[PDB]
């Protein structure tokens, strides 16, 4: 549970970073790098969170 809480806190922190980068946008290449890191991190952490619900399923028998 705490390992998923850490992931949720990290996701919220990444949202804060997204807000900061968007505020800064309002260099261009650095912003594009931040958006691509945004996409990569969102995908990886979303799939990690999806996987986390699988371990809770297979924890009792293990």
UniProtKB/Swiss-Prot annotation:
The modification N6-acetyllysine is found at residue 36. It comes from the Eukaryota. It is found in: Cytoplasm, Cytoskeleton. Dynein heavy chains probably consist of an N-terminal stem (which binds cargo and interacts with other dynein components), and the head or motor domain. The motor contains six tandemly-linked AAA domains in the head, which form a ring. A stalk-like structure (formed by two of the coiled coil domains) protrudes between AAA 4 and AAA 5 and terminates in a microtubule-binding site. A seventh domain may also contribute to this ring; it is not clear whether the N-terminus or the C-terminus forms this extra domain. It is linked to Charcot-Marie-Tooth disease, axonal, type 2O: An axonal form of Charcot-Marie-Tooth disease, a disorder of the peripheral nervous system, characterized by progressive weakness and atrophy, initially of the peroneal muscles and later of the distal muscles of the arms. Charcot-Marie-Tooth disease is classified in two main groups on the basis of electrophysiologic properties and histopathology: primary peripheral demyelinating neuropathies (designated CMT1 when they are dominantly inherited) and primary peripheral axonal neuropathies (CMT2). Cortical dysplasia, complex, with other brain malformations 13: An autosomal dominant disorder characterized by global developmental delay with impaired intellectual development. Some patients show signs of peripheral neuropathy, such as abnormal gait and hyporeflexia. CDCBM13 is associated with variable neuronal migration defects resulting in cortical malformations. Homodimer. The cytoplasmic dynein 1 complex consists of two catalytic heavy chains (HCs) and a number of non-catalytic subunits presented by intermediate chains (ICs), light intermediate chains (LICs) and light chains (LCs); the composition seems to vary in respect to the IC, LIC and LC composition. The heavy chain homodimer serves as a scaffold for the probable homodimeric assembly of the respective non-catalytic subunits. The ICs and LICs bind directly to the HC dimer and dynein LCs assemble on the IC dimer. Interacts with DYNC1LI1; DYNC1LI1 and DYNC1LI2 bind mutually exclusive to DYNC1H1. Cytoplasmic dynein 1 acts as a motor for the intracellular retrograde motility of vesicles and organelles along microtubules. Dynein has ATPase activity; the force-producing power stroke is thought to occur on release of ADP. Plays a role in mitotic spindle assembly and metaphase plate congression. Belongs to the dynein heavy chain family. This is Cytoplasmic dynein 1 heavy chain 1. The chain holds residues 3195 to 3506 of 4646 of the full protein.
